[PDB]
Amino acid sequence: CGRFAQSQTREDYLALLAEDIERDIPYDPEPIGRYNVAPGTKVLLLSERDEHLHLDPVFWGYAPGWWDKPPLINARVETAATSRMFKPLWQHGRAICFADGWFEWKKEGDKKQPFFIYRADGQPIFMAAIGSTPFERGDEAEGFLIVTAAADQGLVDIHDRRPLVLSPEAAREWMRQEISGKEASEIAASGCVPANQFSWHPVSRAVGNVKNQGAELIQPVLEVLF
DNA sequence: GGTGATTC
Ligand SMILES: [Mg+2]
Ligand SMILES: [Mg+2]
């Protein structure tokens, strides 16, 4: 849950979530074009404020002033709502990070094989996030985290954890300011997209290096190498 | 107050 792709246009991601009137997001036809989105960068993050959807560039990582460790990039759904650290973000900082799919590295012996995981039906994924509001302030240390869950069914074949991916319906409800922390927990449990909705393939090991940013990084290898 | 890779 530490790398993903966000390569399509804003409209490609927003079309499934709301009518245009519900957005305060300027039209932009340019694909976001990111094939290797890394922790510690600014990522376009979707949230609701002032009764409209907003898209803000937000640091992927969370390190409050009292936190003297490396910024956290994930929050476990099992405990985040009651965590002394994450509870205020669960209540007031919910957001969505949309993506084409995400990468996981399957460990085999002492080496890894990266996989690109995506919805078989072609839809983008809406990953549940929590973060430090107000998002538009461009904070350098207190940004957002991707909520994770235990891997289910086939995804356990790759890694023990997975991002909490919500249906488009659940993703919209997740962002609403009217929805409480407890109601957010209900959405997280009932809205998680099951692993059987995803397919995956091995991709080039070049994706491991965050300096690599070509479109080939999400494509299937021509020959699986061991 | 917690959870990815790098000829690191
Ligand atoms: Mg060994
Ligand atoms: Mg600050």
Distance between the termini: 23 Å
Q: CATH superfamily assignment?
A: SOS response associated peptidase-like
Order of helices and strands: EHEEEEHEEEEEEEHHE
Query: What compounds sit in this structure?
Result: magnesium ion
Determine Rg (CA atoms, Å). 17 Å
Question: In CATH, what is the class?
Answer: Alpha Beta
CATH topology: hypothetical protein yedk fold
Summarize the helices and strands and which ones pair or pack:
Layout (H helix, E strand, L loop, with lengths): L3 E3 L3 H5 L19 E4 L4 E8 L2 E8 L14 E3 L10 H6 L1 E6 L1 E8 L2 E9 L5 E7 L12 E7 L10 E3 L1 E2 L1 H8 L5 H11 L6 E5 L24
Parallel strand pairs: 5-10
Antiparallel strand pairs: 1-2, 1-7, 3-4, 6-9, 7-8, 8-13, 9-10, 9-12, 10-11
Helix pairs in contact: 3-4
This protein binds one DNA strand of 8 nucleotides through strand 5 and strand 7.
Structure characterization notes:
The protein is of the alpha+beta class. It has a single domain (1-226), classed as SOS response associated peptidase-like (hypothetical protein yedk fold, Alpha-Beta Complex). Helix content is 13%, strand content 32%. It has helices at residues 10-14, 87-92, 168-175, 181-191, and strands spanning 4-6, 34-37, 42-49, 52-59, 74-76, 94-99, 101-108, 111-119, 125-131, 144-150, 161-163, 165-166, 198-202. The strands form 3 sheets. Strands 5, 6, 9, 10, 11 and 12 form a 6-stranded mixed β-sheet that branches. A hairpin with a 2-residue loop joins β7 and β8. α3 runs antiparallel to α4 (181-191). Bound molecules: magnesium ion (2 copies). It binds one DNA strand of 8 nucleotides through residues 1-4, 38-39, 64, 66-67, 69-70, 72-76, 79, 83-87, 102-105, 112, 114, 145, 148, 159, 161, 207-211.
